[PDB]
Design a binder for this molecule. Structure first.
Ligand SMILES: CC(=C/C=C/C(C)=C/C(=O)O)/C=C1\CCCC(C(C)C)=C1CCC(C)C
Ligand SMILES: CC(=C/C=C/C(C)=C/C(=O)O)/C=C1\CCCC(C(C)C)=C1CCC(C)C
Lengths: 214, 11, 214, 11
């Protein structure tokens, strides 16, 4: 009941017009600010108690950001485009020790997004679904978040089938990239925690705050 | 905890 | 084109009629054998080259087994029923140091499976989708596995909407437990690798083989 | 490698 994909697409268009690891971390810190503005534009997100808004973002920021630069890089050959305007090529990632996870992003996310021509509306919805994760520990009212998630995918499915009537399996194909996103998201965090432990690699304040407990 | 995030959401 | 849910339900009915950690590990080794027989009963699985059959099972065994004992425990209060006929209560899991992951299983999987009354046919399909993971590294023909996965969820969606016409969001709700399954699956493996490192905790030959590289 | 698994799938 009330969760128009037009509002979601708008949130998307509204937020987005040497060591490659360092550059990636600087980009992630920069996008963390933009992510907050994005969520605020997602219907009913702001109407939730501040405590739960914090929980949802702290729980999904990584998948949310990974989905964004992945969809943004669909045009690029073998690399991804950072929000800062810099490009990280596959070879560059490999030469810095993060080749395996970088390849997983290109293979499981970017490639697949390109093969099906996932549009901005679809991306927006998928991120909205990730944002509205009812499994987030600590939620004051999980059922309420669960209800919002269902309205997003209800609207998303309607969008599909009407926009891509000739692809009856599109809706399912979209949701089926979520397990991959979750997996890649967890691996990216492990690397990040390790980078912090090792000491090298500058980590800005917002990114660092995301690495705080719990 | 989570100082920055809170400040951003409230504004 | 050809992937009847009747064959899938049959695979399901066909395979299934002190340290809690040790008992769980013994159960997992026992089910690994049954899992092989289950897959063999999944349409077109055996027609794939042995090499890919090995890759698919080595990549999904954990999620496949986690989904099974989770659905099997929907009746139990706060615990899960092992295939060996033993029950692991929540308190017992907590007293052995594995309380956090055990609770995640009850909260994110079992509870949710119980709240929506996920039936055996639905479980079977979800496991079939997990089995047919096109992202598995090394597949000789990923597109072929991708094609099979789409036929399973195509059949699954048809099953829903026809069996639960009053729940237009059931199909999506089912697929949306997959990211959780992936997450819980990765955490369970971490524990297992750690148990092997530490030396304590007997690990049988089939389970141990699953911990082999890659 | 993966001795057991192979044997089981072949039979
Ligand atoms: C959480 C994460 C966020 C990204 C944000 C950005 C880069 C956003 C934007 O530019 O639009 C991902 C991280 C952060 C920690 C280190 C690594 C890697 C270096 C381990 C990765 C994954 C980077 C991918 C391209 C392989
Ligand atoms: C891969 C896995 C498989 C299970 C198989 C079975 C138990 C199947 C059957 O009985 O039907 C799960 C494991 C194996 C490694 C140790 C742990 C825990 C002790 C860390 C868990 C997760 C067990 C859940 C109930 C918390």
């Amino acid at each position: 009941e009330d969760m128009p994909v037009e509002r979601i697409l708008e949130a998307e268009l509204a937020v987005e017009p040497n060591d490659p690891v360092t550059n990636i971390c600087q980009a992630a810190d920069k996008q963390l600010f933009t992510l907050v503005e994005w969520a605020k534009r997602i219907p009913h997100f702001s109407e939730l108690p501040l405590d739960d808004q914090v929980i949802l973002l702290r729980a999904g920021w990584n998948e949310l950001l990974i989905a964004s630069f992945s969809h943004r890089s669909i045009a690029v050959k073998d690399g991804i485009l950072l929000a800062t305007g810099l490009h990280v090529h596959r070879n560059s990632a490999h030469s810095a020790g993060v080749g395996a996870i970088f390849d997983r992003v290109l293979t499981e996310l970017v490639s697949k997004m390109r093969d099906m021509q996932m549009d901005k509306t679809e991306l927006g919805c998928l991120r909205a679904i990730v944002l509205f994760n009812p499994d987030s520990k600590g939620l004051s009212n999980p059922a309420e978040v669960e209800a919002l998630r269902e309205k997003v995918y209800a609207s998303l499915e309607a969008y599909c089938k009407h926009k891509y009537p000739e692809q009856p399996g599109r809706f399912a194909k979209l949701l089926l990239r979520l397990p991959a996103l979750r997996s890649i998201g967890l691996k990216c965090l492990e690397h990040l925690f390790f980078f912090k432990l090792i000491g090298d690699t500058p980590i800005d304040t917002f990114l660092m705050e995301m690495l705080e407990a719990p | 905890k989570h100082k920055i995030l809170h400040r951003l959401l409230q504004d």
